[PDB]
Amino acid sequence: XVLKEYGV
Amino acid sequence: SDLTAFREHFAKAKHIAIITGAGVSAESGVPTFRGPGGFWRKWQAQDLATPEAFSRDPSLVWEFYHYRREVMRSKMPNPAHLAIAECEARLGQQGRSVVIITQNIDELHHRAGSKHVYEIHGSLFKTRCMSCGEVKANHKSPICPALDGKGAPDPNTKEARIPVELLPRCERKSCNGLLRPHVVWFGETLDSDILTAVERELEKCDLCLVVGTSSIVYPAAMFAPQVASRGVPVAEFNMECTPATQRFKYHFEGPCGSTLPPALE
Ligand SMILES: [Zn+2]
């Protein structure tokens, strides 16, 4: 699932 | 980039998707708590908006989320929010869809009368139960008694250090689980069900608006490539400059509340 803000 | 060019597309468009970022909530005066000087006490959102923070100090995080639930009582939708809502309504009557896909959690779109909305980061006014997982709406002020008059933003303010049992609990009595905000923290993933839906909506759409953020950055960057690869026009309305030479197709620089309402009339 998609890390919110891709992580950074 | 031209307004008339945009309006000609707008006239013909049957399925419009509007992606909204922080800029539009900022124009209503809702603080982001990120970057330059947006501090709540000693901390920023980066620090408090995480699973770890909540696990470590659920009082402190709930003070943060309580303060933010209460500041919304005085912040109202700006004209961008309303222009969008009134557009959705007007177009709907004509059999023309308008969906909002928002990163914002303040429900300002809902408050302006938008109906077809996807809150991809959740909402300040929903709780999730840490035991049974139940998601429920919550606009109560204060959310629980223990937090009444708490959450003060001064670096001084003494921590409320509320016992976990007195923080918001799950009203289904067999459960009594600790509630958390139904929001997407840093280090968490998005809802696959919501993205699947959004994917379907962006595949339908024949005009896409980005408002208060840009296509190049999260979250628009997930989805704009899809719509753009179909030849669908993308119109940005935000406050960022465009290089002298490399003019963006439909980029309407300036605050959403000014730029958007004449675009959508
Ligand atoms: Zn529960």
Alpha-beta content class of chain B: alpha/beta
What distance lies between the first and last C-alpha atoms of chain A, to the nearest angstrom? 15 Å
Which fold does the CATH topology of the largest domain in chain B refer to?
Answer: Rossmann fold
What is the gyration radius of chain A calculated from CA atoms?
Answer: 5 Å
In total, how many beta strands of chain B?
9
CATH superfamily name of the largest domain in chain B? TPP-binding domain
What would you call the quaternary organization?
A: heterodimer
- Name the helicity range of chain A: under 10%
The tally of structural domains of chain B comes to 2
If classified by CATH, what would the architecture of the largest domain in chain B be?
A: 3-Layer(aba) Sandwich
Largest sheet of chain B: 6 strands, parallel
Strand order of the largest sheet of chain B: 3-2-1-7-8-9
What bound compounds does this protein have? zinc ion
The CATH class of the largest domain in chain B, by name, is: Alpha Beta
Shape of chain B: elongated
Characterise this structure.
The complex is a heterodimer of chains A (8) and B (265). With 8 residues, chain A is low in regular secondary structure. In chain A, 0% of the residues lie in helices and 0% in strands. Chain A has no helices and no strands. The N and C termini of chain A lie far apart (15 Å). Chain B has 265 residues and is α/β, with parallel strands linked by helices. Chain B has two domains: 1-30 and 76-119 and 189-265, TPP-binding domain (Rossmann fold); 31-75 and 120-188, 2-Layer Sandwich (SIR2/SIRT2 'Small Domain'). Helices cover 33% and strands 17% of the residues of chain B. Chain B has helices at 3-12, 22-27, 45-48, 51-56, 58-71, 79-93, 108-111, 192-204, 224-229, 256-264, and strands at 15-20, 97-102, 117-119, 122-129, 135-137, 179-183, 207-211, 234-238, 250-253. Chain B has a six-stranded parallel beta sheet, with helices on both faces. Chain B is elongated and about 60 Å long. Chain B starts with a helix and ends with a helix. Residues 129, 131-132, 134, 170, 172, 175, 177 of chain B line the site of zinc ion. Chain A: This is Carbamoyl-phosphate synthase [ammonia], mitochondrial. Chain A: The modification N6-acetyllysine is found at residue 4. Chain A: The modification N6-succinyllysine is found at residue 4. Chain A: The modification N6-glutaryllysine is found at residue 4. Chain A: Can form homooligomers (monomers as predominant form and dimers).
